[PDB]
Design a protein around this ligand. Structure first.
Ligand code: A1BTD
Ligand code: ZN
Length: 139
């Protein structure tokens, strides 16, 4: 689990969105595994606006943060789960690291701010849904 709070928005994994997230929907993209809902309280996370390929992510199944090198956002094949059939997920970045389903929502950060959130895993890889292109999150 985990979310990003920036301005009047909450960014979550689309497959983990709650009833309140869907009742306050701003934008959702199934191909990205992202959903953004509106909030009443002001968030103060900072979104990175950069092309970093190194950062640190939080892994709840190890209660640890790990430094990683990650690929640029791209269209990657993701195996079927209970939430989606096998498909290409867009705007996904991979790194070598540990990730279990409950790790979704953990933040990946670089020196500039929040880069994305854990969205995939298995086979010793971890995948993060990028949010750096969503420039409207700041206005
Ligand atoms: C071994 O499976 C995982 C490991 C870590 C994280 C997630 C999974 C399996 N996923 C992938 C998600 C997606 N983005 O399509 C939905 C889901 O349940
Ligand atoms: Zn950066």
């Amino acid at each position: 689990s985990g979310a990003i709070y920036v301005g009047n928005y909450r960014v979550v994994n689309r497959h983990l969105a709650t009833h309140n997230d869907w009742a306050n929907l701003v934008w959702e993209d199934s191909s990205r595994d992202l959903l953004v809902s509106s909030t009443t309280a002001q968030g103060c996370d900072t979104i990175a606006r950069c092309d970093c390929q190194t950062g640190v992510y939080y892994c709840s199944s190890r209660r640890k943060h790990y430094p990683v090198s990650f690929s640029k956002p791209s269209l990657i094949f993701v195996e079927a789960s209970e939430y989606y059939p096998a498909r290409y997920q867009s705007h996904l970045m991979l790194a070598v690291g540990h990730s279990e389903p409950g790790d979704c929502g953990g933040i990946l950060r670089c020196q500039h701010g929040v880069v994305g959130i854990v969205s995939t895993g298995g086979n010793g890889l971890v995948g993060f849904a990028d949010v750096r292109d969503l420039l409207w999150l700041d206005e």
